[PDB]
Amino acid sequence: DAENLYFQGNIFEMLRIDEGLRLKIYKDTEGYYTIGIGHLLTKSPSLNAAKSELDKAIGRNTNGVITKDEAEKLFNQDVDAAVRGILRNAKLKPVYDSLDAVRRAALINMVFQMGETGVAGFTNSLRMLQQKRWDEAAVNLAKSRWYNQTPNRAKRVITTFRTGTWDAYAADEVWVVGMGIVMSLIVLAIVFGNVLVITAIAKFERLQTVTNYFITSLACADLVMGLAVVPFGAAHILTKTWTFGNFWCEFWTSIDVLCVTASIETLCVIAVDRYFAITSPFKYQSLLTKNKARVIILMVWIVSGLTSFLPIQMHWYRATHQEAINCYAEETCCDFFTNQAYAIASSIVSFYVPLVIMVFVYSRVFQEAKRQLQKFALKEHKALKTLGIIMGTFTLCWLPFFIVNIVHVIQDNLIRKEVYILLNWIGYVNSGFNPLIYCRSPDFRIAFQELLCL
Numbered sequence: 001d002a003e004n005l006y007f008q009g010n011i012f013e014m015l016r017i018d019e020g021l022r023l024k025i026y027k028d029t030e031g032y033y034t035i036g037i038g039h040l041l042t043k044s045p046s047l048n049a050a051k052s053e054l055d056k057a058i059g060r061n062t063n064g065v066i067t068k069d070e071a072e073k074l075f076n077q078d079v080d081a082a083v084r085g086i087l088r089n090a091k092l093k094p095v096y097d098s099l100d101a102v103r104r105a106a107l108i109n110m111v112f113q114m115g116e117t118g119v120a121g122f123t124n125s126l127r128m129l130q131q132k133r134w135d136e137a138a139v140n141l142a143k144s145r146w147y148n149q150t151p152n153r154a155k156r157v158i159t160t161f162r163t164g165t166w167d168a169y170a171a172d173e174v175w176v177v178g179m180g181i182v183m184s185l186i187v188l189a190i191v192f193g194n195v196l197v198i199t200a201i202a203k204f205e206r207l208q209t210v211t212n213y214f215i216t217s218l219a220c221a222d223l224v225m226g227l228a229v230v231p232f233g234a235a236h237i238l239t240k241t242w243t244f245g246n247f248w249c250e251f252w253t254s255i256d257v258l259c260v261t262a263s264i265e266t267l268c269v270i271a272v273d274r275y276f277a278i279t280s281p282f283k284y285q286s287l288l289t290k291n292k293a294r295v296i297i298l299m300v301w302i303v304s305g306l307t308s309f310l311p312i313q314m315h316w317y318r319a320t321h322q323e324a325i326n327c328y329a330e331e332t333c334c335d336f337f338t339n340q341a342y343a344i345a346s347s348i349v350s351f352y353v354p355l356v357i358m359v360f361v362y363s364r365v366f367q368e369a370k371r372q373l374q375k376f377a378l379k380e381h382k383a384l385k386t387l388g389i390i391m392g393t394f395t396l397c398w399l400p401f402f403i404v405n406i407v408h409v410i411q412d413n414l415i416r417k418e419v420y421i422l423l424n425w426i427g428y429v430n431s432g433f434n435p436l437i438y439c440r441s442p443d444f445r446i447a448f449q450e451l452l453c454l
């Protein structure tokens with residue numbers, strides 16, 4: 001023994017990967033009602049009949065939703081029962097003893113998906129496993145109804161029978177560290193680039209323009225993103241729990257909407273800023289005093305703090321469904337749950353209103369470039385590439401999330417929890433992209449050369 005590295009070999013982890021933990025009732029690949037980790041509730045298609053078995057098996061009014069503690073106990077029970085059925089059964093016991101440790105898990109994994117009676121119907125494939133003809137049983141087992149309905153999970157178990165090793169599953173562990181180091185590169189990039197932007201404007205007179213005053217507010221929201229928002233969410237995803245208590249859960253949730261709102265509303269302020277600086281250069285400097293710009297900065301942070309802490313810290317954002325009420329009570333749960341009132345209104349204030357203003361002025365900056373005092377020249381394609389990056393980058397990062405942000409409260413279980421977090425993180429990396437977009441000026445290009453080399 002003496003093995004506490006990561007990924008031990010066991011049926012416990014093997015089944016977590018094939019089943020996945022899911023606290024609310026759901027229809028499996030076939031359509032049967034299931035909960036927890038691959039727990040079959042009932043074959044009756046009525047959801048109320050599924051709750052009745054769950055409420056009896058739990059000893060509580062679950063409302064179709066169980067806690068992460070209850071799911072683990074149903075998972076060990078279904079596992080311990082699959083072994084008891086292998087031992088009570090005539091076809092399975094000889095093959096279970098004849099099997100080695102790793103291939104015993106493959107036999108338990110079938111019995112926990114199909115029952116003792118079902119796994120025992122593989123008379124030929126069990127006869128092949130009996131004589132240790134792994135490659136021949138792997139060919140046989142790939143011809144069955146079981147392979148046909150869940151080819152992914154069957155190919156993994158069949159490979160575990162064939163090779164006798166966990167390579168069908170051990171590749172899962174490489175994706176954990178690869179996700180982690182990628183998160184570390186994201187946190188370093190956002191903090192590196194945005195601390196550099198804020199510093200160049202603070203120490204350097206040539207960079208204290210009105211347009212950089214908005215750049216500074218953008219880099220401030222992006223800096224808090226990489227110092228506060230991103231790091232706790234990386235610890236959330238990797239630990240698969242929340243270790244900082246309930247109060248810090250919502251105030252991490254509060255700082256997140258605070259930054260993403262102020263970040264995008266600043267990008268909207270910049271798009272209008274350059275529209276006046278480009279199309280009306282002379283009034284743009286007469287009207288927009290450094291004080292008037294600072295008031296515009298306070299409007300964004302006041303709209304953002306009202307759209308982020310005020311709802312969340314007042315519990316207005318909260319959902320009412322049972323998995324939401326449980327997560328609000330779990331100290332270790334910090335999953336995001338909202339009502340359709342908040343998921344919609346925040347997307348308008350955070351993303352959609354700024355998006356429309358931005359799609360409007362940037363396009364108008366080019367329509368009114370045409371009606372000037374003058375030939376298919378090269379600097380227009382150069383400028384056309386530049387704004388395509390300014391709007392192609394902002395769109396690909398946040399549009400996929402805020403679309404999904406609206407849909408996940410319109411038709412439930414249409415957007416997997418997994419995808420909602422990935423598109424959310426795909427938005428988080430906008431904060432690292434921004435310094436590489438809005439700070440390409442020769443004045444910045446010099447301040448960055450002197451801040452680093454000299």
Ligand SMILES: CC(C)N[C@@H]1CCc2c(ccc(O)c2O)[C@H]1O
Pocket residue numbers: 233253256257260261336343346347350405424
């Ligand atoms: C809860 C944290 C972890 N993610 C949020 C969830 C929705 C949301 C974001 C940003 C701005 C908004 O307006 C939002 O409604 C995302 O970052």
Ligand code: NA
Pocket residue numbers: 246249327328329330331333334
């Ligand atoms: Na909570």
